[PDB]
Amino acid sequence: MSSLVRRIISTAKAPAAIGPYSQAWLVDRTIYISGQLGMDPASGQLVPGGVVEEAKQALTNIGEILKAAGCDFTNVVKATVLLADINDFSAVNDVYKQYFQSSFPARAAYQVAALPKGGRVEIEAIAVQGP
Amino acid sequence: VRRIISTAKAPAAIGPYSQAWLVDRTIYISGQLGMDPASGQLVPGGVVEEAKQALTNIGEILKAAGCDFTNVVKATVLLADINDFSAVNDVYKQYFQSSFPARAAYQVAALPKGGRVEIEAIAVQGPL
Amino acid sequence: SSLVRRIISTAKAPAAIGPYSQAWLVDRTIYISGQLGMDPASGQLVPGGVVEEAKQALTNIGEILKAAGCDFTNVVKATVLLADINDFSAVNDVYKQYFQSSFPARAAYQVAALPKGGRVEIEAIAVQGPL
């Protein structure tokens, strides 16, 4: 008796879902984004190079999903960084660094036991639509 | 639209938390293990059987808030062994038939009571 | 259409050891960053172990809530991250001293490692009162 707008997000500029989930959902004004690994949308595999290159690809994947929802990085209000080794903390912050330039979102970060597909880093996020 | 959601004749005291909270139109649900509503103990059979009970418990909480599985928008799957990824996904699909929600999944070091799987979720009420 | 959005930043909580803000208020919901048992003035962990670190982490969460016009009764969800699952009972006893009644929804588990070698970290979400 008071309907809410719900819309699915799906773009090829981002990797396909290796499991039973959707890329993102928009409900009312909030966007829930699934966890992203450092996978290349063209090859379907993790990029080589290690944790730094995987973190750059994962954040680029998040950017294409945000644009497909009519947003950019200034719309993110919270994020979670999952690491395979707590000793990569300083290096990952240096890549995370450049995408959220200032006015950083809320965040949480810790080392996990293992990630799917043997990845070294995984990142999820929540955003709110303009204005 | 701000109240604690509780199921009738059920246990929920493995510590200081509530089953779920409804605020405005969003429902925040606590992480669920494969525990028996009648026995208070983990069900036998392993990780595959524990996942079936954990999702059934989530279903009973949704019903107490006037919703079903089509109202879930996000979920997180916590595993004790990453080797169980494929098996848990096959059970997960049987509850969400199509139009899957957003999700995240990874392996943790350990779960309470020695459980093998735990699932939390968020839902939004509908005008249905 | 346009919604309210602003940042939270007060010196009664520790400064951010990385690219994140203490909390975000959007519409009526508050997203709070994960807190360790750090002393707000020195940025060092308080002495005593996991029991003392849990008390300080919850005190930090309280000061951020007040800077957003809330208290502990406004929290609807929280996550408890432990370095050792055998600390479950002791941390639960500290938890009850801050969330006394009508408990929020929760999740708890043991992670592989936390930043700065902490023994416990807690995040939460809150919603403002009607008043």
Curated annotation (Swiss-Prot), chain B:
Q: Which GO terms describe its molecular function?
A: 2-iminobutanoate deaminase activity; 2-iminopropanoate deaminase activity; mRNA binding; RNA endonuclease activity, producing 3'-phosphomonoesters
As recorded in UniProt, its EC number(s) are 3.5.99.10, 3.1.-.-
* InterPro entries xref list: RidA, RidA_CS, RutC-like_sf, YjgF/YER057c/UK114
Q: Name one GO biological process term.
A: mRNA catabolic process
Give the catalysed reaction(s), semicolon-separated. Answer: 2-iminobutanoate + H2O = 2-oxobutanoate + NH4(+); 2-iminopropanoate + H2O = pyruvate + NH4(+)
Question: Where does this protein chiefly localize?
Answer: cytoplasm
Q: Does the keyword Lipid metabolism apply?
A: yes
Q: How does it assemble?
A: Homotrimer. Interacts with YTHDF2.
Functionally, this protein is described as follows: Catalyzes the hydrolytic deamination of enamine/imine intermediates that form during the course of normal metabolism. May facilitate the release of ammonia from these potentially toxic reactive metabolites, reducing their impact on cellular components. It may act on enamine/imine intermediates formed by several types of pyridoxal-5'-phosphate-dependent dehydratases including L-threonine dehydratase.
Name of the protein in question: 2-iminobutanoate/2-iminopropanoate deaminase
